Ligand SMILES: O=S(=O)(O)C[C@H]1CNC[C@@H](O)[C@@H]1O
């Protein structure tokens with residue numbers, strides 16, 4: 001279970017026969033040192049550099065047997081040392097606790113042994129890679145980037161005035177947790193800046209900007225079993241409300257009458273509609289970016305007259321109303337004033353209230369480390385959204401904490417920055433828990449951190465461009481779902497049609513309908529107008545568009561019994577709803593390299609069309625008896641090509657599924 005072999009100051013550590021650590025004087029496992037962080041932010045985009053002062057290999061290791069395991073004193077002369085404790089924890093997990101000699105040694109580099117053939121998955125929500133082997137991954141929550149690839153034109157345009165284009169590793173939800181194909185997970189407790197480097201064939205290197213580190217590992221015989229264990233450590237999500245399965249949630253702005261009119265147009269045309277999502281429930285702010293929300297979390301009766309009574313009528317017709325909140329407060333409005341009066345805002349170095357620039361306006365940061373401010377903001381949600389009758393909301397942002405804020409708990413903003421998303425999620429979760437609404441109300445988040453696996457009821461993929469790019473278009477959503485599934489979050493959707501509308505990018509009708517085909521094979525369907533609604537093709541753009549939504553929402557609703565079962569398994573044991581093919585086909589080597597296809601539950605395989613102008617699509621089937629959803633044709637394992645016009649996405653089901661007869665009914669929809 002634990003094999004430590006000591007000897008010339010050299011050792012190895014095996015754990016359930018996996019080699020975890022090796023150390024000798026010539027090949028050390030540990031370096032320590034110091035640096036001065038050089039971090040700046042503009043509008044959520046961060047520039048991060050180290051001024052590295054020292055990096056020193058600790059070649060001398062003195063070992064002793066301990067109360068619960070082994071203690072290693074590492075050093076390089078008397079002046080430079082650290083201690084490592086090796087134990088089991090309360091549940092049998094390997095526990096490594098590292099503490100440097102003093103606080104001035106604020107850098108660590110730790111190497112873990114690896115094999116050249118190993119694949120690595122997770123690190124939160126990753127949009128450019130699913131398998132992480134071969135590259136390094138900085139872990140710092142931020143804006144996710146527009147374009148995200150230096151070689152593409154839009155990324156270059158987003159970089160022109162502002163550091164906004166980003167790169168392959170930028171994300172709203174990085175997490176210091178990964179899975180190896182030696183069938184273990186590694187979880188790090190720290191929230192400091194970290195870089196997890198998976199590029200060397202013989203070792204993984206974990207770099208931390210702190211004087212201590214805590215890591216836990218567990219193994220298992222299958223990936224399914226490993227995810228059950230990972231979610232028993234980090235959390236499991238609740239079952240979704242029953243109405244999520246009942247149709248599409250329409251994203252609409254412009255007030256009570258506009259919402260009513262668009263609702264009737266779609267319902268009257270045969271579309272299954274379960275909800276209206278109106279982010280402008282609190283008012284609007286026009287900026288050069290386009291149409292934004294007014295960040296003051298109170299119902300605006302000028303934009304939305306009679307909303308309270310109108311929600312009661314919509315609910316009797318089987319339609320829910322969903323709103324919008326974030327953990328910041330516009331500086332020109334009432335809630336910010338109320339928070340300043342009480343001292344509820346994050347401060348600057350001089351003790352004044354810190355105002356962040358959010359894109360042509362300013363806002364305060366509600367200090368969620370102050371228990372009274374956190375209680376106050378939870379009451380804002382309960383009184384202004386739950387009591388109004390909202391069935392859910394977008395719970396946005398979490399990524400913008402500057403490193404020169406000062407917080408009520410006295411912990412550096414260099415450490416609290418990455419921890420803010422799960423603190424925000426917990427605020428939402430407890431609002432629901434204290435009003436008895438878990439399983440009835442649904443909120444959805446884009447940002448996350450350790451513990452969002454418990455506290456976030458649903459993830460969405462944040463802001464994609466209204467384009468076909470691999471790094472920031474429709475395609476990018478699949479690695480995002482898969483990476484999070486491997487980090488213990490199994491409920492994921494996207495904006496139908498994407499969001500970011502800039503430069504020459506504008507949403508075509510073809511993009512909207514292909515994205516609709518994709519989302520009908522996920523656990524939630526919800527549209528978005530985008531930041532410039534007049535430049536994008538919308539769900540009611542023409543009769544053909546409306547009819548495509550009626551067909552594909554009939555497809556999604558038909559799947560209800562199946563999806564409900566999958567969501568219940570995710571709640572019970574962390575078995576995610578959208579699954580990497582290797583969860584069920586562990587001996588197929590080729591499945592470990594796929595990024596753009598997934599299993600929906602156990603029995604459906606989906607390979608979404610993510611390129612413009614296609615009439616067919618090529619994909620990989622693992623070895624099983626498959627049936628093409630739309631033709632009923634039989635297929636076996638191998639590379640295959642199928643016809644794929646709009647409305648017939650590349651979808652296959654297992655012939656031997658207990659659900660085969662439900663899936664066979666799909667080809668008879670109009
Ligand atoms: O423009 S707003 O900041 O108010 C709201 C948008 C930003 N976050 C993600 C988008 O989906 C929202 O519409």
Ligand SMILES: [Ca+2]
Pocket residue numbers: 144145146147463464465472500
């Ligand atoms: Ca983006």
